[PDB]
Curated annotation (Swiss-Prot):
The keyword Calcium applies. Its main location: secreted. This is Alpha-lactalbumin. Ca(2+) 2 binds at K79, D82, D84, D87, D88. It comes from the Eukaryota. Keywords: Calcium, Disulfide bond, Glycoprotein, Lactose biosynthesis, Metal-binding, Milk protein, Secreted, Signal, Zinc. It is found in: Secreted. GO terms for cellular component: extracellular space; Golgi lumen; Golgi membrane; protein-containing complex. Disulfide bonds join C6-C120, C28-C111, C61-C77, C73-C91.
C-alpha cells in the first residue's frame, strides 16, 4: 500500500495542529521519508526503520535486530509494515510528543517553505 497525496491527506486530516504541526508539512515530510509506502524498510548498521513514518527499531519499536531497544511505542516493528496505519499514527504522535518533528530529517530540509503544493486537490 502506497498512498497518493490525497488519500493520505484525508486519513491524516484529524491530526492537523497536533504538536503545532501543519498537515501539509507532515505530508511533505512523509513524501521524502517513505514515499507514502507502508512497506518501506530502510536498513544500515545498528538499525532498520519501518513503514510510512520510518520508525526506528533503535528506540521506538521492538525487533530481533536490536534487543536492547527501549521500545517506546510498546509494539513490534512488523506492525508498521501492514496496511493499517492506525497504530503507526499512534506511535508517530508519541514521537511528536517526546522528541518533536525533528525526528524526520526531511522536515527542516525541504518542508519549511513551498508548502502550497502539499495540499490536496479534489476527488
Ligand atoms: Ca500498522
Ligand atoms: Ca503493507
Amino acid at each position: 500500500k502506497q498512498f497518493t497525496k490525497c488519500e493520505l491527506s484525508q486519513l491524516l486530516k484529524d491530526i492537523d495542529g497536533y504538536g503545532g504541526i501543519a498537515l501539509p508539512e507532515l505530508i511533505c515530510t512523509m513524501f521524502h521519508t517513505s514515499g507514502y509506502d507502508t512497506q518501506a524498510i530502510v536498513e544500515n548498521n545498528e538499525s532498520t526503520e519501518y513503514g510510512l513514518f520510518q520508525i526506528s527499531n533503535k528506540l521506538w519499536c521492538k525487533s530481533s535486530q536490536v534487543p536492547q531497544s527501549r521500545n517506546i511505542c510498546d509494539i513490534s516493528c512488523d506492525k508498521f509494515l501492514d496496511d493499517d496505519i492506525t497504530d503507526d499514527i499512534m506511535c508517530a504522535k508519541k514521537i511528536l510528543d517526546i522528541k518533536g518533528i525533528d525526528y524526520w530529517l526531511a522536515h527542516k530540509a525541504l518542508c519549511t517553505e513551498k508548502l502550497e503544493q502539499w495540499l490536496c486537490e479534489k476527488l
